[PDB]
Amino acid sequence: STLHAKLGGAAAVAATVDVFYKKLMNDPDLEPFFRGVDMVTLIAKQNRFLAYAFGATTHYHGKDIVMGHAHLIINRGLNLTHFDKVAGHFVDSLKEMGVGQELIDEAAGVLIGVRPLFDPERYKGKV
Numbered sequence: 001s002t003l004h005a006k007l008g009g010a011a012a013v014a015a016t017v018d019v020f021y022k023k024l025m026n027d028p029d030l031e032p033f034f035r036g037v038d039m040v041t042l043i044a045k046q047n048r049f050l051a052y053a054f055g056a057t058t059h060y061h062g063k064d065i066v067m068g069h070a071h072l073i074i075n076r077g078l079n080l081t082h083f084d085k086v087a088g089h090f091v092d093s094l095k096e097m098g099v100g101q102e103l104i105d106e107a108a109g110v111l112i113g114v115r116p117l118f119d120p121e122r123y124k125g126k127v
Ligand code: HEM
Pocket: 030, 033, 034, 037, 040, 041, 042, 044, 045, 048, 049, 052, 065, 068, 069, 072, 078, 082, 083, 084, 086, 111, 114
């Protein structure tokens, strides 16, 4: 079924995005990566992140994740600890919204699958 049906309805989708967004902005270890990023881009990012975790995207693959984040890994020290914190905030958001365990596991499997793309050892020319 649709993404919004899985997650409790359209209202719940936007609520989940807000929970997840606020967790990132309120985490002192992650907020600096969002400095200077306009809010429309950020809200769109969170929506696509959520859609991707549940296989609701169609034109977004690992290579797109790398091309979208490579500058942070190379020029801003983005690393696996940051990835694991973002991923933890995401599943915490799902739990806080009353999302069940089967959907949590599915999202976790996706996130674990793309974690290796945030390994800085895979990139050259870093700070
Ligand atoms: C599963 C891992 C991730 C996925 C699927 C994902 C998804 C996305 C998407 C879809 C965008 C496009 C935003 C847009 O143009 O509207 C984006 C950009 C961005 N992501 Fe992620 N993200 C992930 C991990 C992370 C992590 C760990 C961070 C650390 C803070 C992060 C920070 C950012 C930033 C700062 C941008 C904007 C870059 C810019 O526009 O200059 N992302 N991400």
